[PDB]
Amino acid sequence: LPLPQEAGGMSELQWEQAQDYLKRFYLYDSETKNANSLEAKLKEMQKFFGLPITGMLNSRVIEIMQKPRCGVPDVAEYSLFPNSPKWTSKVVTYRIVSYTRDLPHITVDRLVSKALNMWGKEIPLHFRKVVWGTADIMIGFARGAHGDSYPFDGPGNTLAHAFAPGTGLGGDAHFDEDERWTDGSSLGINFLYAATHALGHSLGMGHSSDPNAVMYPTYGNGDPQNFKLSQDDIKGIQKLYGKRSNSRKK
Ligand SMILES: [Ca+2]
Numbered sequence: 001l002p003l004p005q006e007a008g009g010m011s012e013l014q015w016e017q018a019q020d021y022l023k024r025f026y027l028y029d030s031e032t033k034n035a036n037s038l039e040a041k042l043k044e045m046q047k048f049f050g051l052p053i054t055g056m057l058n059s060r061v062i063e064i065m066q067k068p069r070c071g072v073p074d075v076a077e078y079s080l081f082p083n084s085p086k087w088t089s090k091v092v093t094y095r096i097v098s099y100t101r102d103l104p105h106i107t108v109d110r111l112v113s114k115a116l117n118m119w120g121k122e123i124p125l126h127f128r129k130v131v132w133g134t135a136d137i138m139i140g141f142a143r144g145a146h147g148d149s150y151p152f153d154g155p156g157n158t159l160a161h162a163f164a165p166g167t168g169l170g171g172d173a174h175f176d177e178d179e180r181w182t183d184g185s186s187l188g189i190n191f192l193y194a195a196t197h198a199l200g201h202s203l204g205m206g207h208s209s210d211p212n213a214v215m216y217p218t219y220g221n222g223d224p225q226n227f228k229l230s231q232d233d234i235k236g237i238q239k240l241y242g243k244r245s246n247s248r249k250k
Pocket residue numbers: 152153154155156157158159176178179
């Protein structure tokens with residue numbers, strides 16, 4: 001595979017932006033603002049991404065920082081209403097709120113199920129179809145100005161923000177309408193590939209350090225038509241829902 005080196009000749013703005021980019025991908029900590037904290041903080045990011053090169057930021061580490069992925073952080077903390085991190089219910093329901101002109105309501109609705117279903121089929125849980133009433137996980141499009149925190153940011157950084165399984169209103173699925181969504185066009189963020197990563201967030205799941213994980217933050221490569229849930233991904237949830245067998249953090 002390729003591996004250029006443009007960061008070496010990048011401007012201070014590009015290098016400085018990387019520092020803030022990793023901050024938004026985690027939480028709002030303006031106290032960590034420091035030169036030394038960069039090494040320690042950056043190190044923690046390496047484990048989250050899975051990349052070997054630690055304390056690095058110019059080669060692959062910087063590339064992922066500028067490359068799109070998800071609009072959700074890697075660390076949260078807001079009371080403990082819902083039991084356990086992942087879904088603890090006996091059934092999961094989902095319903096699309098709106099569709100993007102990029103794809104038909106049928107293609108978008110079916111896409112979510114194509115990925116959301118794969119998640120359930122890999123767990124002893126259970127999913128239910130929506131045909132009358134409201135669902136737990138709402139699949140709608142909107143920008144950061146739709147009435148939520150964090151700015152839309154527009155195209156690029158930040159793909160979509162997902163909510164955790166908490167309360168009735170929480171645990172919904174959102175997508176950056178400003179981004180590029182499509183399937184048969186395979187030009188932007190494949191709804192199928194994005195759905196798996198986005199839908200997985202609603203299940204409380206977390207990014208994997210495996211190079212072949214479905215929740216991999218480095219999303220972007222040969223995507224086969226048989227693309228499905230990853231090994232470490234299924235084994236990870238099975239350890240919390242069923243039996244464990246040597247796993248890692250989220
Ligand atoms: Ca964006």
